[PDB]
């Protein structure tokens, strides 16, 4: 009752999402497809790779996750943390990306691209 896949899950690394991937072998980019208070969960190499902490500037997120809304502009009372081009953010108690650059992709990756990106 929310907390499965939401706030709890195995794994949940306590050093950094860089420190949790050359630590274990695969160095391949960080997916963050679920995202809490309480740490983060990324699609990341070949599976899924639960920590706490807050994302690191040049992580990649999920297409899932960014924020694109039509009235939403990036409010600093939301603003947790700031990556690359986009903004890991918690509005409206949710977590979300605000993509500056939805275009080009400022870090995002499909879910077609995820399953791609862990190949
Ligand atoms: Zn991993």
């Given at each position: 009752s929310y907390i499965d896949?939401?706030?709890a899950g195995q794994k949940?690394?306590?050093?950094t999402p860089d420190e949790v991937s050359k630590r274990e072998g695969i160095?391949?980019?960080q997916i963050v497809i679920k995202i809490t208070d309480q740490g983060y969960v990324?699609?990341?190499g070949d599976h899924?790779?639960?920590?706490?902490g807050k994302v690191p500037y040049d992580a990649i997120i999920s297409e899932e996750l960014?924020?694109?809304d039509p009235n939403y502009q990036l409010k600093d009372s939301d603003?947790?943390?700031?990556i690359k081009g986009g903004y890991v953010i918690k509005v409206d108690?949710?977590?979300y990306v605000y993509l500056k650059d939805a275009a080009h992709a400022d870090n995002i990756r499909t879910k077609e691209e995820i399953k791609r990106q862990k190949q």
């Open positions: 896949g939401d706030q949940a690394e306590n050093l160095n391949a980019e990324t699609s990341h899924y790779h639960y920590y706490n960014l924020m694109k603003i947790v943390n700031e108690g949710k977590y």
